[PDB]
Amino acid sequence: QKLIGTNLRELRFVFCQNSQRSLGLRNYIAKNYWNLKNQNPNFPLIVRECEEADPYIIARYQYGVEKKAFAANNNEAEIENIIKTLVEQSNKVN
Amino acid sequence: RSTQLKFYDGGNRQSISGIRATIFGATGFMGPYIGAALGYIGSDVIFPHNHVYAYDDYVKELKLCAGSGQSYIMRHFNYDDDNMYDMAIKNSNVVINLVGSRLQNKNFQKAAYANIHVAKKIAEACARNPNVRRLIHFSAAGADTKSPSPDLHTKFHGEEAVLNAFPNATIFRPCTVYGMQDYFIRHWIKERDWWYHFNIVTDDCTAKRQPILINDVAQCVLNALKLQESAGQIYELGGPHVYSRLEVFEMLANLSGRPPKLAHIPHDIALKITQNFYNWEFFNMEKVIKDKLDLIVTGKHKTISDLYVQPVSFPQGAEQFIDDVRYRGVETHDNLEK
Amino acid sequence: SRPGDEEQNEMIRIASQKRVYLKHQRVDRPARQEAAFISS
Amino acid sequence: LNRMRFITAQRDRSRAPWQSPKGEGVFQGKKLIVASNSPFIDDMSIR
Amino acid sequence: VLSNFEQVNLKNLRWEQNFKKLGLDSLDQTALLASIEHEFTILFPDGVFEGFENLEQVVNYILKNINAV
Amino acid sequence: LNPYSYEALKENHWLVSDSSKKNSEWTHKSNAEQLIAKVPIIYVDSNIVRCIGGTEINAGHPQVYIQLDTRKHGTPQTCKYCGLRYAKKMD
Amino acid sequence: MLLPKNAIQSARYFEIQKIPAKIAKTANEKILSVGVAQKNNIQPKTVTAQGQIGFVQHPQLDSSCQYTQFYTPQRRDIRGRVARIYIQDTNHMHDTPQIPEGYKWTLEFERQAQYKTPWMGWSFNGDTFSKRNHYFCTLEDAISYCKQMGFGYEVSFPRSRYHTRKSYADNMLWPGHDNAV
Amino acid sequence: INFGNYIRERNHYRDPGLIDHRIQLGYELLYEAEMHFSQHTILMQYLSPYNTPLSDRGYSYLEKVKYGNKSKFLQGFYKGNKPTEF
Amino acid sequence: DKTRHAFDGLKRQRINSPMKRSKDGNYEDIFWEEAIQTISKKCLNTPSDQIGAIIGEFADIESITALKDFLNRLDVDNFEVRQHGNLKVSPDFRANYLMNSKITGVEDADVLLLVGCNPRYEAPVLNARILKSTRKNLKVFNIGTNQDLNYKNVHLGNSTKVLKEIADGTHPFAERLKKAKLPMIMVGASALEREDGAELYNTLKVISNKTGVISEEKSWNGFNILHKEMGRINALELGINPTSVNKNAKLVFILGADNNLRPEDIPADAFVVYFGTHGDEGAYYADIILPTAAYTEKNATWVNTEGRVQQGRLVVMPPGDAREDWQIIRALSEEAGVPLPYDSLEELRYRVAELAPHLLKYDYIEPTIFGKVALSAQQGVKTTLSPTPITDYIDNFYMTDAISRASVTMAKCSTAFNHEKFSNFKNLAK
Amino acid sequence: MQNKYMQPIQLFIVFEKLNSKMWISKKLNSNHSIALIPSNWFYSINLFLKRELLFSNITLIENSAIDTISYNLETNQNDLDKTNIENYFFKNKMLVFYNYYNYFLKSKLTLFIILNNLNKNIDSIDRIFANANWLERETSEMYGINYKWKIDTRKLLLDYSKIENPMLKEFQSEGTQDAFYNIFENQVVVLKNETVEL
Ligand SMILES: CCCCCCCCCCCCCCCCCC(=O)OC[C@H](COP(=O)([O-])OCC(O)COP(=O)([O-])OC[C@@H](COC(=O)CCCCCCCCCCCCCCCCC)OC(=O)CCCCCCCCCCCCCCCCC)OC(=O)CCCCCCCCCCCCCCCCC
Numbered sequence A: 001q002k003l004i005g006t007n008l009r010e011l012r013f014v015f016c017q018n019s020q021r022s023l024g025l026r027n028y029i030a031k032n033y034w035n036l037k038n039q040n041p042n043f044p045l046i047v048r049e050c051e052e053a054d055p056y057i058i059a060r061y062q063y064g065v066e067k068k069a070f071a072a073n074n075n076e077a078e079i080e081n082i083i084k085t086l087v088e089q090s091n092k093v094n
Numbered sequence B: 001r002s003t004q005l006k007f008y009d010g011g012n013r014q015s016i017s018g019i020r021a022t023i024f025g026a027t028g029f030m031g032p033y034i035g036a037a038l039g040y041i042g043s044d045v046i047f048p049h050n051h052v053y054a055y056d057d058y059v060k061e062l063k064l065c066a067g068s069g070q071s072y073i074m075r076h077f078n079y080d081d082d083n084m085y086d087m088a089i090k091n092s093n094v095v096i097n098l099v100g101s102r103l104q105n106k107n108f109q110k111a112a113y114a115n116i117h118v119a120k121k122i123a124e125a126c127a128r129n130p131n132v133r134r135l136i137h138f139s140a141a142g143a144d145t146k147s148p149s150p151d152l153h154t155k156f157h158g159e160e161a162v163l164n165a166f167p168n169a170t171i172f173r174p175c176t177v178y179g180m181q182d183y184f185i186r187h188w189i190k191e192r193d194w195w196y197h198f199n200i201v202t203d204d205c206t207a208k209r210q211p212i213l214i215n216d217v218a219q220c221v222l223n224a225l226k227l228q229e230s231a232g233q234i235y236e237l238g239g240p241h242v243y244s245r246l247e248v249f250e251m252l253a254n255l256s257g258r259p260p261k262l263a264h265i266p267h268d269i270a271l272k273i274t275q276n277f278y279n280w281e282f283f284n285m286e287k288v289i290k291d292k293l294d295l296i297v298t299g300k301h302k303t304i305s306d307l308y309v310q311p312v313s314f315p316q317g318a319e320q321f322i323d324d325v326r327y328r329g330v331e332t333h334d335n336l337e338k
Numbered sequence C: 001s002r003p004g005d006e007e008q009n010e011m012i013r014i015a016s017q018k019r020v021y022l023k024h025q026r027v028d029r030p031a032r033q034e035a036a037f038i039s040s
Numbered sequence D: 001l002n003r004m005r006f007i008t009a010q011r012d013r014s015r016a017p018w019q020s021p022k023g024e025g026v027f028q029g030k031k032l033i034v035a036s037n038s039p040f041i042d043d044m045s046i047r
Numbered sequence E: 001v002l003s004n005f006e007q008v009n010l011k012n013l014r015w016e017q018n019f020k021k022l023g024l025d026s027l028d029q030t031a032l033l034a035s036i037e038h039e040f041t042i043l044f045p046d047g048v049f050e051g052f053e054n055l056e057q058v059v060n061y062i063l064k065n066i067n068a069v
Numbered sequence F: 001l002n003p004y005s006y007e008a009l010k011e012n013h014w015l016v017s018d019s020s021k022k023n024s025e026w027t028h029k030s031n032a033e034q035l036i037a038k039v040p041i042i043y044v045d046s047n048i049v050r051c052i053g054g055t056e057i058n059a060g061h062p063q064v065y066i067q068l069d070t071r072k073h074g075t076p077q078t079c080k081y082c083g084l085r086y087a088k089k090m091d
Numbered sequence G: 001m002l003l004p005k006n007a008i009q010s011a012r013y014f015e016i017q018k019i020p021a022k023i024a025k026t027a028n029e030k031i032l033s034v035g036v037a038q039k040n041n042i043q044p045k046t047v048t049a050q051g052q053i054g055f056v057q058h059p060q061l062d063s064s065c066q067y068t069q070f071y072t073p074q075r076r077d078i079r080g081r082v083a084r085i086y087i088q089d090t091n092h093m094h095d096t097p098q099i100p101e102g103y104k105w106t107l108e109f110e111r112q113a114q115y116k117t118p119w120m121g122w123s124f125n126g127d128t129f130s131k132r133n134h135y136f137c138t139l140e141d142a143i144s145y146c147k148q149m150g151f152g153y154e155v156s157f158p159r160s161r162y163h164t165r166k167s168y169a170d171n172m173l174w175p176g177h178d179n180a181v
Numbered sequence H: 001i002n003f004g005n006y007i008r009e010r011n012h013y014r015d016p017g018l019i020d021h022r023i024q025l026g027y028e029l030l031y032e033a034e035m036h037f038s039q040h041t042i043l044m045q046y047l048s049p050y051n052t053p054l055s056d057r058g059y060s061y062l063e064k065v066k067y068g069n070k071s072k073f074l075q076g077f078y079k080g081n082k083p084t085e086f
Numbered sequence I: 001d002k003t004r005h006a007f008d009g010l011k012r013q014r015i016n017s018p019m020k021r022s023k024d025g026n027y028e029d030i031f032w033e034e035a036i037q038t039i040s041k042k043c044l045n046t047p048s049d050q051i052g053a054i055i056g057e058f059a060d061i062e063s064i065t066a067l068k069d070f071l072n073r074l075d076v077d078n079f080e081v082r083q084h085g086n087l088k089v090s091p092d093f094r095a096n097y098l099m100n101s102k103i104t105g106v107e108d109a110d111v112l113l114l115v116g117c118n119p120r121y122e123a124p125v126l127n128a129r130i131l132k133s134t135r136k137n138l139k140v141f142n143i144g145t146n147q148d149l150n151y152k153n154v155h156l157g158n159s160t161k162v163l164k165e166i167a168d169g170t171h172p173f174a175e176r177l178k179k180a181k182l183p184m185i186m187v188g189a190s191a192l193e194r195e196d197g198a199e200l201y202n203t204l205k206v207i208s209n210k211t212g213v214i215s216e217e218k219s220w221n222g223f224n225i226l227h228k229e230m231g232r233i234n235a236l237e238l239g240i241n242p243t244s245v246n247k248n249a250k251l252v253f254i255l256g257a258d259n260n261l262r263p264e265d266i267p268a269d270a271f272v273v274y275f276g277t278h279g280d281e282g283a284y285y286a287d288i289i290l291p292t293a294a295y296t297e298k299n300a301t302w303v304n305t306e307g308r309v310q311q312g313r314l315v316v317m318p319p320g321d322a323r324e325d326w327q328i329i330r331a332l333s334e335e336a337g338v339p340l341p342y343d344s345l346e347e348l349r350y351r352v353a354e355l356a357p358h359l360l361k362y363d364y365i366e367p368t369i370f371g372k373v374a375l376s377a378q379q380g381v382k383t384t385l386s387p388t389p390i391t392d393y394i395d396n397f398y399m400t401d402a403i404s405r406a407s408v409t410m411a412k413c414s415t416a417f418n419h420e421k422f423s424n425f426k427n428l429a430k
Numbered sequence J: 001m002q003n004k005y006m007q008p009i010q011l012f013i014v015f016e017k018l019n020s021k022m023w024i025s026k027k028l029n030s031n032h033s034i035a036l037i038p039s040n041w042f043y044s045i046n047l048f049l050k051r052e053l054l055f056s057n058i059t060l061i062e063n064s065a066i067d068t069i070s071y072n073l074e075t076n077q078n079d080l081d082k083t084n085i086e087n088y089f090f091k092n093k094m095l096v097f098y099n100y101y102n103y104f105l106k107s108k109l110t111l112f113i114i115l116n117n118l119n120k121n122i123d124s125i126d127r128i129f130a131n132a133n134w135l136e137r138e139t140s141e142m143y144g145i146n147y148k149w150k151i152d153t154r155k156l157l158l159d160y161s162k163i164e165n166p167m168l169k170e171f172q173s174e175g176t177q178d179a180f181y182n183i184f185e186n187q188v189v190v191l192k193n194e195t196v197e198l
């Protein structure tokens, strides 16, 4: 979580604010946004809320390359695992 | 100066092309086609002319090139006054010149005047006017100082003078252009109809010819305007293949169904008669002289491929213009319906 | 009776409905939208 | 022969092209310094 | 005649395969049959015209026909 | 007398003025401004003046009325249909 | 312009109300497949005059647009164009027009090239299709026409004044006691 | 083949009445062509190739040479869609 | 009056063709192909480290999205080149850079406090609404300049001392806010654009949290920010960080920016490509100029200060040879060899949906449930303000942007009203 | 209306399965009556009219169609009453109307038929009334009505080698293409349309 700035160029979380399909990602963001921001001060962590939207974690690595992870019906542990995989895969991507 | 020309070719006659063009010598066979090429995209076209008879269809049909408010006809043009040229090309960013000695003229002085004096004055006027972006002079293929033909002899000097006066001038050297109102297919048809027994040749008919369609010539003009780098260079325009005069006669005979018959007159006696008698369209010394000469595309200058125009083959192009004049032999009853 | 009589009757019925215009329909000012905050 | 004036006026009624600088001009860093062409007087600046 | 229809490869041509295998839809089939009629100066009745399924049947029909030029 | 000055704009109704009256020859394709400017101010005793642009109804413009009792005495007022300018004969 | 609620309950009427969900076909659309899915999930499921969220619907070049007449050899740009469906209200200049507006849905097409010719300065339109607006009694009819003719359509719903209590007695109001603070 | 392409563009129809009306119109236009009611230049618009040059003219490949291996969007962007004079 | 009579600017000083400036300074017209080819060559030659961009005032969602995608594919991440003034706000949550309370929230708030805001000059319609609210039930306080507002206001001060006191709780206005129900805080973008904008923003956050401007029991979020650049609002919506500034940039892309530009911002040796519609400013810093469409000529999306996303429609096509900015960026990317995945407006809006779907719900404000989290005050933040006055950026209401500067009616209004409206003193009558 | 008038109730007495919707107005002549007739019964009704005793002396004066889809009351919207004929225009794709004159009864009878199907199918009556041939040809070409069992469907008053329905409200008066003369083809050609806007 401390290496997000160097590994990735942007993290984005697009989900719905009143759907059970997004509940997990919604709660995880609400709980850990400040932790991640403190760990990585200047890194962009964008949050976007739209009703009846599919949960999605979008990691932009470098040179306009992005990976989109479908995080529907995923517990906070699953969201943690997906984010960790996205951060770790930066070396393989570039 | 700048040779760039920003114009929009995606519009019809009522659009604004962005080309303001003055076309000298547009009363000839190729004049209406060249004018229509620019007019049909919305360009403004000016046609300066001093033609007799004024009521001729050649003058009249020039008004159809662009339309109302876009095509203008400047009558009673004076070809030895610089003010006349200045007025003609005052608002034109394109200046096309097709003023060349007619096939009916045998006088060397008149041919030189038409092919040199007018061209040089037009080039000088273009140089004076800083808004003339492009100049397109029409020379003839095979132009040379040693050419026996007075027309070609004077056209070589004319193109040299145009280049000297306006270094950004584009010189075309078309081969024998054919079409509905041409001097080649129409002349063949009319001569064979007037004799009914033969076409009168005055040579061995081994001279090479590389015909090009007038539509292809117009497309070449448009492509030359589009291509900025074409400025200041000489182009030779011709068909994909080269045929001799005998081969051209054979192709026309095969296409039209009319059996061929070439009646030979000695070249010397024909030359003497034509140079000592009155000359008109169908009886002139220029035709006799050019029968022997070769008018083809040489590799010394740029070709049509440089303009990126694919000319159509002569057998395909000339077939439509001889549909009416077709031999009526044995035909099917279904074909009798017409 | 032909099959299309039912369609004709449907057309006649719908042609007789009362009609009103959105321009003349009253619209009241909506109350303030209650802002919601994610728990914890 | 004066069609250019009428055409330019008609074009400017709806859209007048910006007159770009021509020839040598003064430069302040990466900027070309040109006096304002607005006929109106900047009264607040003047007084 | 087929040389006009450049979708089909005349080199490896199987006279028993269907027009669809050759690469001709119904419109292409109708155009091809009309072209063959023009070539041989014949006229296929409606039944046979619609019944043709490959080039072999057309060849056999034209062979049986005596009016073909 | 700068046409773009604040004073000039305020006096001319926030329009750029043309003292020579020659620009109208091209702008409006006529010298009618110059022709009408020659007519002097017509002095009318009454506070309100009626103008019909002619000698009889239907021979000019619709009948209009102009107030010559200006908040500043003697200020000429121009008819809207025709450029004739009327002023009160202050005495 | 508003029939009684649930007055029409036909399958055709429900089909007209419902908007199709796009299927990624082009290479760009397949690359942006996630975007197409998000747009389908978020856009309103049905169109009704009571709706409040604007949206843009792509042209449906399908068997449903067979009734269009503006697909000819000379012109091939009219079909598939995007229109705008909205209620045109009376201008703010006047309140009682002789011919009042706002009683019909206007369908409009964005104007193409408009240029003043040099000879006389007359205005000319590159395309003559988008000169006049179309008018429909109901948004349902407008959308049905768009689906039948194969045009895409944006829909922008109207906004009207909020009713407020009006009374001449409000002109005279007692401010209150002078000592009040 | 060109008229086949014309029909293919309309092959999506699924309304028998509309198809019957279209067939009536097609027969009418075919009869006009037979009887010379129409002009050749006016009626050849149906027979003209969709993307191939006409066989009686020399075509210009300047656009293809300039924009070789470029997207149709970029080709249209460079071509423009409005007169630039106004 | 500005929005009513500033459209005249579009009628003159319009760029109608790509242009290039020689070292001598002589501008010359060129073709789109030539301009795009030279720009692509410069992009390929220039390392991504020394490439930067400036966001204009009238940038739209489509144009900013295309520019962001192109820069990302070139590996460029810094979207600001100016270092003098940058907005100090994070684009992570919409709640932290949009008016949490809508434009109708003034009609609901009982106390409204302005910080470096002049509603009369910026959003006059909002000023009229505030006048209605204060005549019915609303008390207005102001920390900054004492502008001639149409309604009575209580001027607490102009320095950051008032903010410090309110944050510390010793100022009586803290008790006033606590007593008041549904208080509102409106802050102009200039205050956050100050050098200490981050400190002022944190001070406002803590003040709001302590005084209940963001109350869960009331279900109220009175924290608001009044912006001055639609382009900046769009950039924040799309997630572009306003603080990311490239100190030294060799290749600058100015997307129609004409305000705050100074020679010092552009290095002498840099290469400037300016996407613009007027030549008043930014066209003189440009090595290459590309005409673009205006709001009346571009079919695009615009997000206003309250978060409402509306669709701006095409009235007339761009003048002359002008092209849509998103199309220009798409062509530039394809020529440079990094083609974008959208060739039409539909596909570009699909990409916009990928980035932030809520922009596809036109004329609607998407609610956010992370307002409290976004605006929560963190521990250990600087929160150190400077002892200087809080000012307002607008000087001449009739001249604020390039279109207004080019307009003639606006010039007449300026010359007819500036001297009559200028006054160093406050109208004690109201 | 100071004349002797009687409703044409014979049609609905004979065709016992149809409902009657009839109008008379002072906007029309004193002896003029409008009625609504379903399309699926139009042909049989014309058969009865052409050979009934008192309707035998009947001539089809006129025939045309109205694109009712875009019909809107521009003024006095609230004054509309449920008995007005305009109520049948709304939401109906097309409305084809015929008008006949009867000599025995000295009467004028107009019949309105509502076409709601998208293809605009209706049985032709040119086999019953001879002059209806060109009337129906014009109506079909100008509005796109698909007349069935028609003697001659060929266009009448439309240009050669063109398909269009100009009288539809969707169509623009300026058209979609203009005819010029092409020098390259040396003949009249037709190309895209650019016109003048006042
Ligand atoms: C009476 C007093 C008593 C004593 C007797 C006196 C003499 C009595 C003579 C009685 C007979 C008179 C007959 C002529 C009547 C008037 C007409 C006329 O003169 O001809 C013009 C007339 C014009 O043709 P047209 O059909 O009216 O034109 C229609 C359109 O304009 C065409 O429309 P288009 O669109 O198809 O245009 C195509 C193009 C033409 O088509 C083409 O493009 C292809 C051709 C281009 C080149 C043409 C060069 C000239 C060809 C001449 C051919 C002559 C015919 C015989 C050829 C035999 C070959 C083996 O148009 C043209 O150029 C038209 C032709 C121009 C001809 C110009 C020269 C004509 C005058 C000189 C002719 C000399 C011929 C001598 C023959 C040998 C005599 C022994 O016809 C001719 O040209 C043929 C005339 C042949 C007879 C000439 C008789 C006079 C000379 C005889 C020799 C000397 C006297 C000997 C006796 C002395 C006794 C003492």
Ligand SMILES: CCCCCCCCCCCCCCCCCC(=O)OC[C@H](COP(=O)([O-])OCC[N+](C)(C)C)OC(=O)CCCCCCCCCCCCCCCCC
Pocket: B106, B107, B110, B276, B277, B278, B279
């Ligand atoms: C009822 C009236 C009848 C009139 C008939 C007239 C017959 C032709 C008379 C020719 C006279 C020639 C005089 C000397 C010319 C000197 C110039 C010269 O260089 O000589 C060689 C001339 C010149 O031709 P060239 O081509 O060799 O050289 C041109 C001249 N230079 C070189 C100076 C530029 O040619 C000739 O052979 C003589 C002239 C032939 C003219 C042919 C056209 C005649 C048109 C007649 C119109 C009237 C018709 C009447 C009937 C109407 C019925 C409705």
Ligand SMILES: NC(=O)C1=CN([C@@H]2O[C@H](COP(=O)(O)OP(=O)(O)OC[C@H]3O[C@@H](n4cnc5c(N)ncnc54)[C@H](OP(=O)(O)O)[C@@H]3O)[C@@H](O)[C@H]2O)C=CC1
Pocket: B025, B026, B027, B028, B029, B030, B031, B050, B051, B052, B079, B098, B099, B100, B101, B102, B103, B110, B113, B114, B118, B138, B139, B140, B141, B173, B174, B175, B176, B177, B183
């Ligand atoms: N087979 C061909 O067509 C070929 C043509 N060219 C060149 O292309 C040009 C155009 O083709 P085309 O139409 O066939 O040529 P034309 O002979 O038909 O036209 C020549 C033009 O120049 C005018 N003209 C002739 N002499 C003079 C003169 N002394 N003073 C002023 N004007 C004069 C003519 O007007 P007027 O009617 O008044 O005499 C005419 O308008 C030719 O002139 C020629 O230079 C080159 C190779 C082949």
Ligand SMILES: [Zn+2]
Pocket: F051, F052, F053, F061, F079, F080, F081, F082, F083, F084
């Ligand atoms: Zn008067």
